[PDB]
């Protein structure tokens, strides 16, 4: 299919915009080319069941959570978007795990990525839950859907999260404020950034990806 050859070439162009030594961020000056590329792939009939290259999921995660910053990073806590982001993050982790199974020690790097991944994922789910609990009235249907898909299926945690959605708004807000202070977003920003950088390094060093990590691998 020539449409498939065109789509693959659009993917190669996005690679040169998306792959960074550090974290991707959209520049106003690149917005038209990047957007035109994404839209072309998004409506390309031959890409509907193609696998998303991992560099695209990584760029999405860096853009979605604004990993280029370290301040309020203008994260859009919307249920549908954050649910897609978690699925994307899981695809990344899935692919990182396969890389490890086929200068750096594998056992150490895999363990570090797994710990960062698990912390980052729990932080994202909790802050999505916080956003749900801070609205009045609560969107209980999507709140519940989100907790089944992504809330760690522990007895007494989902026990309590669903009781708390039934507290009144002033109490929900006091409780959410306390837990946000106990666990600020800046910690999960750092963990998630380090997860992405750890993953980029492992993929380049141990498999045939290029994530422009040459200047980091060398200092080992």
């Amino acid at each position: 299919s020539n449409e498939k050859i065109r789509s693959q070439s659009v993917l190669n162009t996005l690679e040169t915009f998306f792959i960074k030594e550090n974290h991707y961020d959209m520049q106003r000056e690149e917005s038209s080319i990047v957007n035109a590329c994404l839209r072309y792939l998004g409506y390309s009939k031959s890409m509907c069941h193609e696998k998303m290259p991992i560099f695209m999921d990584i760029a999405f995660i860096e853009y979605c959570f604004n990993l280029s910053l370290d301040p309020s990073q203008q994260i859009l806590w919307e249920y549908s978007l954050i649910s897609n982001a978690l699925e994307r993050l899981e695809n990344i982790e899935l692919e990182r795990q396969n890389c490890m199974r086929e200068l750096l020690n594998k056992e150490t790097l895999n363990n570090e990525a797994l710990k960062l991944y698990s912390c980052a994922k729990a932080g994202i789910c909790r802050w999505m839950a916080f956003h749900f609990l801070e609205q009045e009235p609560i969107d209980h249907i999507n709140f519940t859907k989100f907790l089944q898909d992504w809330g760690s299926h522990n007895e007494k945690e989902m026990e309590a999260l669903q009781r708390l959605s039934k507290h009144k708004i002033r109490k929900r807000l006091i409780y959410v404020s306390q837990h946000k202070k106990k666990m600020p977003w800046s910690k999960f920003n750092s963990v998630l950034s380090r997860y992405i950088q750890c993953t980029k390094l492992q993929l380049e060093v141990f498999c045939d990806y290029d994530f422009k990590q040459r200047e980091i691998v060398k200092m080992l």
């Binding site: 150490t108 710990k115 698990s118 729990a122 909790r126 945690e157 106990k182 666990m183 380090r194």
Partner: peptide
Amino acid sequence: DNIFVKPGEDLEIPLLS
């Protein structure tokens, strides 16, 4: 032997209560 997680860093998240 530590590159991305720092020695003694706590990446375990409190449960909700």
